[PDB]
């Protein structure tokens, strides 16, 4: 492995966040998508960013729909330092009221085209994966590629679930397809050994699917967005396929690592309960070499009055009273009162703590303090930031609902997952 | 409403008395400079004074320590018009066998401090737990036009006999000291804490004020006192201060109010550490929305617990807890507690790094005992310094109940009944302490 | 002796008004957001307000600007990115000058929801094209002590200079009770006041019986939301409409006297004079550097300036210049400037260059018959503003003999405003051309 | 490289010690802090090269601590760092300096230790230099500098085999031993027409040592040595260790003495290419940002000179000179063939008045002075009508009590030296 010029001074990271589907609502109701809490100590945005930094990419642009003081403070307090690097948030619009990937990038082509760089690293979507973009860049160069598309291998089963690419002798992408049913699926079968897989697993996974992350030569992208296809919206559907029709060197690169998508409540839910996996969680946030970074907070060590946790992870600066936590992920600052039970749940915690004087007024006012009230029962749920769950609240959804837009009540049910909205106040005794 | 003009940042220099040799806090100091001794699961002593200075708006700070340490330099380096530099008297991680007093350590570097264009020097002992905004303290030093201002800690007769008591006049000016006075000498030190603005009731119970290693000194005064006046004084506030007073210099007292404990003793250190899990609320809390205690950003992941039962305990960052019972203890960063373990009344300083599966399967094929508390162990009333490789079935419970014990070879010490396993130490399986 | 509490850092948000379409400083603003315009040889306009904030202890700063530019972004990134920040809030996200108008109020209102996300007590509103230094704290301190809703920095002046500003009338306590936009005749005469009321002596108060707003305001957070969302949702001008209206509602709009140099540099003529002004003798009315509150800028690490044979009178030389055998009189020479053999620079502002062209490059340019960046051989440039990366060819004489005053020749690389010739950025004027 | 330097290589800069060769420049400040090129300090050379080489771990060994030296380092420069390690507890060998801190260096988990000793202007990507030490399974790769003969015999030399391996060391060898040192630099890198022109390789004082190796060489194999050059490395070779050589051909000019120093400085003003520029499109020499204003010039006629930052120049002439930062030059003064270190700050017109009515001169070149072939240090106060011209073309001398010291005919005014009006030199 060796890139020259150095990636740090020759590559520009462009993360496609913000602009995304409301597939994560209500989590994206009162906040920029990139800012969505993850793993109890992190935020979605921290993944591609950390990967960029760990991959020696120091020039990072975070694309988003609108501006967030929260996103900034997070990115500013955790990365604003890396020299000659930077991590700037570029926002699509001027307000949270109301795009298309290629559109997103094109909007700021005027800014992008200013940096002296060889390639643009286009990272889009929402995934939990650990990649070293460097090897991916090297391939892009050692092939005089104009566009190098990262590809995920898969057997013909889950193959008709994604968009498939076809490669020639050299691995040059020659054709595309969206869930080719069956009569025309086999046509997409290529022998992936050409991309680095061993005959064994290549015969198992004879299909390649776009991963939604690319490397494009500084000049190509400018020409593609600015001239060849100025009216396109998405990349993996228009630009990429179109640059192919023009006969450009569109190369494939195979990623054989962990890759879990999390653009939906269920996927996200399950992804998060994933680090409580036995005996080894397939994805680990911490890594001796390529760890995921976050905002330094200087929170105290979690306190535990009399808790009986089992198969769960606990975030920083927690205050936990006598209770029972099972198979769950407790976010930072999370307060859990007496006799509470938490099961297969993701408690995102809080952004700040409330003092005793505070819990004092709230009481006299008859309101509920931040946290899980006394003797509450939380099952299969996501309790967003600053939730105020009153006493005796039971979130068990016994009738087993699957859809509910109970916003006014501070919640939402999707795929059977109850999700207490951020800053929501769930009154004592309420059952769900 | 009142501010330091000029600002603390550019007119004050922090001089932290990190420590020297670490005789008192041994074995914790063993080949580790005192300022770096692990504190409250995620911090190090040096964090308190430094943090207090940063929050107090003092960005220029030095840390004197008889010997140096690799980690102290890594901590400060990574953790921190400002700077934090270590000024060692001996560039060796080895515990010095020669003595160096505080005025010695300070005077030895007086020449470098002189190079700084500041009005005062803030002399702080890096051995106590507590929070303080030195801004008013300094503010006071200037408004009272004193040569040296001394922080005063009020206390009752009982606590009084183990401190350096001051006697002030009606204007708060100090005019006489007494080192750990008793009998009649003590009686003669009774003062009217009212003068310093103390509560009238909290005054009847605490008619004594003690120096507390906190001082503000005008530049010139310092150079004068250490160069001309007392060039042979070893102890700073034990001689140099009382000495200044006796020369007619303006030595004013500034009443200090709040939690304050000296933690240079194994017992004192122990206590203050387990004192963070005091059922109601710890009298001292590292966290503070306004002035928190800073430490090194480690990016450790959330602590995992397979089947734990924690009571009156605090868990640091990135711990890996299997099935076990943790009671009234402190668990430092990267701590590994194995299956069947039982922790009672202990302070686990944790580890400096995690051991991988490679070192695992290796130390498992050759048998060696990995870092952490081995299976079915039992640690009662102990301190387990960093990277302790504790075999399985170990029972650290001081059966014979020995107060003082020095078995540095077997990998540990014992003080006031506290079994402190030495850093890096290895206690073979079955061992019983 | 006394300071804010809380301190400006956590309780004061800085909102800067970098500019609209920059139609006044054209062509210096041609495809360049106003905040970015090169200033004083080694700075950009935006450095004045941002630096005043930082030096006043204000770490949370936003910069408003109708459009955007790469340079503004790169600059703020490098010079200040380092709980503070200096983010740009643009109306239009393109470098193209907006052909549509937007006001200072429409501007702020547009992002009020963002400003709304900041737990601050006040909003410091600063214009972004005024040359001056100021410790905003005491001024904010006044806003809190007098429990005002809006405090307006006031500038004393004489009848002659008053007619070009927005004047205000104060009562005995200094509470503003009236406004008048660019008042003249008896309209003006009624705006006379007693300056001693704000702390001026009687000698100067007699010399300057007027006080004009100067685009500096402190504003309680909610007074802002209320005024912009409810009380005047249709206002476009923040200072000539929204303020008076708030006054007209009986809100506590208090004045605060400003002492010192202050100069508007948003028009060409004034921009020219202010920039040339640092060459003043025996001293400059305004100095960029200062022991305690300097005007910051991006660290470039450029090498010291190189001079082969320069007869330089009353001038300023920025970082990394390359002068040969020439004459530089009463001029400002920007960073990376390249003045050639036998050149004569009289009374001009050389913006400089964004980069150095290597020998090789010069070879290609010569072979293609083009001009390298910089003032060419035997060039005579007087009373002009030469924008960044200009390629002035050999023997060019920008001397405007026909004494023209206004001329729009954007196609030839220059506009003439008030007799001041301005060469557009990256312009190229061929050998022997006389302007 | 892989792992990369940033994380696998530690930087150890040595530039303290006596180095008295530079008296009185190093009289007060530590050696690394010596002013340079109008806007720099010696230390910026080896530290800048490191950074531009992706070397983050950087230590700087100095005889003693310096308030101004650390401010310069902190202000100018999250895995990397640049820390100063003092050898003594007060300002009143070389293998010893490294050994003394082995305990500190030992802890860092790296693969190599870049050692940089001595002071001299030069730009080099230590990366290709480490890539070498790695592919050649070297345990110590030494800097190889080719040269003719007048040079070849002046410095120690290295004989290599047909693998680049170093087998011998000869300190200033002449005659038949000098001949037994010819090597044909074809192996190192240079071609045939270049090599023939210089078949002699001399060590530079820069080496790449494998982490462990250096730990063994300093505490075991040779815990009583003083120099890396003539003792540790030569011995290290004899003991039979893979000691390689690394060719380096690029502007190399030492500056350990006033004359070398002085000449290198004025050298940056030499016509065409000065041989060495601090700035560079790729790897520039970094320095502390002072936000100094542009330089004012009332009526200066300057020739073949270079103006540093924030200078306040009145009526005067400047010839073949290098004016440092904050230089205040007065009317009628004439500066030629000199180097002005500049000044560390400015004095207000209100502060100056307090000088006249005190019988003292304000920092900077007073009125109608005449500076010829001299080095005027920082904060130098030179009253009206001074004439540092060295009339009786002396050479060496000494007049500490007279704010100056003469060496190689160069009058070097001590930092803060107050030279009264009318005096001459
Ligand atoms: N030689 C030394 N250099 C630096 N710090 C030291 C040295 N000796 C002790 N210290 C540390 O300095 C601080 C002051 O020591 P100590 O608690 O004895 O203060 P004291 O008795 O109030 O006053 P003094 O030490 O002047 O007599 C403590 O935090 C201690 O660990
Ligand atoms: N759309 C805009 N966005 C940001 N700044 C703007 C905009 N339009 C003008 N500006 C800037 O706003 C300032 C104009 O305000 P100024 O202090 O001159 O007061 P004014 O012109 O008398 O009244 P008003 O504030 O209503 O324009 C200038 O600094 C100008 O460049």
PDB file of N, CA, C and O in Angstrom, chain B residues 322-325 338-342 374-378:
ATOM      1  N   UNK B 322     -17.720  -9.133  32.997  1.00  0.00           N
ATOM      2  CA  UNK B 322     -18.389 -10.382  32.686  1.00  0.00           C
ATOM      3  C   UNK B 322     -19.422 -10.562  33.795  1.00  0.00           C
ATOM      4  O   UNK B 322     -19.957  -9.587  34.315  1.00  0.00           O
ATOM      5  N   UNK B 323     -19.691 -11.806  34.163  1.00  0.00           N
ATOM      6  CA  UNK B 323     -20.646 -12.096  35.219  1.00  0.00           C
ATOM      7  C   UNK B 323     -19.925 -11.913  36.547  1.00  0.00           C
ATOM      8  O   UNK B 323     -18.954 -12.608  36.823  1.00  0.00           O
ATOM      9  N   UNK B 324     -20.389 -10.979  37.370  1.00  0.00           N
ATOM     10  CA  UNK B 324     -19.743 -10.740  38.660  1.00  0.00           C
ATOM     11  C   UNK B 324     -20.535  -9.785  39.546  1.00  0.00           C
ATOM     12  O   UNK B 324     -21.529  -9.194  39.120  1.00  0.00           O
ATOM     13  N   UNK B 325     -20.065  -9.630  40.779  1.00  0.00           N
ATOM     14  CA  UNK B 325     -20.701  -8.758  41.758  1.00  0.00           C
ATOM     15  C   UNK B 325     -19.751  -7.635  42.125  1.00  0.00           C
ATOM     16  O   UNK B 325     -18.700  -7.872  42.708  1.00  0.00           O
ATOM     17  N   UNK B 338     -13.335 -10.734  35.423  1.00  0.00           N
ATOM     18  CA  UNK B 338     -13.719 -12.034  34.904  1.00  0.00           C
ATOM     19  C   UNK B 338     -14.875 -12.726  35.622  1.00  0.00           C
ATOM     20  O   UNK B 338     -15.310 -12.302  36.697  1.00  0.00           O
ATOM     21  N   UNK B 339     -15.355 -13.805  35.002  1.00  0.00           N
ATOM     22  CA  UNK B 339     -16.464 -14.618  35.506  1.00  0.00           C
ATOM     23  C   UNK B 339     -16.358 -15.034  36.964  1.00  0.00           C
ATOM     24  O   UNK B 339     -15.353 -15.592  37.391  1.00  0.00           O
ATOM     25  N   UNK B 340     -17.409 -14.758  37.725  1.00  0.00           N
ATOM     26  CA  UNK B 340     -17.429 -15.130  39.129  1.00  0.00           C
ATOM     27  C   UNK B 340     -16.706 -14.208  40.093  1.00  0.00           C
ATOM     28  O   UNK B 340     -16.664 -14.475  41.301  1.00  0.00           O
ATOM     29  N   UNK B 341     -16.142 -13.123  39.577  1.00  0.00           N
ATOM     30  CA  UNK B 341     -15.416 -12.186  40.421  1.00  0.00           C
ATOM     31  C   UNK B 341     -16.345 -11.488  41.401  1.00  0.00           C
ATOM     32  O   UNK B 341     -17.547 -11.408  41.167  1.00  0.00           O
ATOM     33  N   UNK B 342     -15.774 -10.993  42.497  1.00  0.00           N
ATOM     34  CA  UNK B 342     -16.516 -10.266  43.523  1.00  0.00           C
ATOM     35  C   UNK B 342     -15.664  -9.103  44.037  1.00  0.00           C
ATOM     36  O   UNK B 342     -14.624  -9.321  44.674  1.00  0.00           O
ATOM     37  N   UNK B 374      -8.880 -12.073  37.627  1.00  0.00           N
ATOM     38  CA  UNK B 374      -9.178 -13.427  37.195  1.00  0.00           C
ATOM     39  C   UNK B 374     -10.508 -13.961  37.687  1.00  0.00           C
ATOM     40  O   UNK B 374     -11.146 -13.369  38.559  1.00  0.00           O
ATOM     41  N   UNK B 375     -10.925 -15.092  37.123  1.00  0.00           N
ATOM     42  CA  UNK B 375     -12.189 -15.735  37.486  1.00  0.00           C
ATOM     43  C   UNK B 375     -12.337 -16.002  38.987  1.00  0.00           C
ATOM     44  O   UNK B 375     -11.365 -16.284  39.697  1.00  0.00           O
ATOM     45  N   UNK B 376     -13.579 -15.921  39.451  1.00  0.00           N
ATOM     46  CA  UNK B 376     -13.925 -16.161  40.847  1.00  0.00           C
ATOM     47  C   UNK B 376     -12.967 -15.562  41.855  1.00  0.00           C
ATOM     48  O   UNK B 376     -12.606 -16.221  42.826  1.00  0.00           O
ATOM     49  N   UNK B 377     -12.558 -14.318  41.632  1.00  0.00           N
ATOM     50  CA  UNK B 377     -11.667 -13.654  42.572  1.00  0.00           C
ATOM     51  C   UNK B 377     -12.484 -12.962  43.645  1.00  0.00           C
ATOM     52  O   UNK B 377     -13.709 -13.040  43.662  1.00  0.00           O
ATOM     53  N   UNK B 378     -11.802 -12.281  44.547  1.00  0.00           N
ATOM     54  CA  UNK B 378     -12.491 -11.561  45.593  1.00  0.00           C
ATOM     55  C   UNK B 378     -11.571 -10.499  46.147  1.00  0.00           C
ATOM     56  O   UNK B 378     -10.607 -10.805  46.837  1.00  0.00           O
TER      57      UNK B 378
END
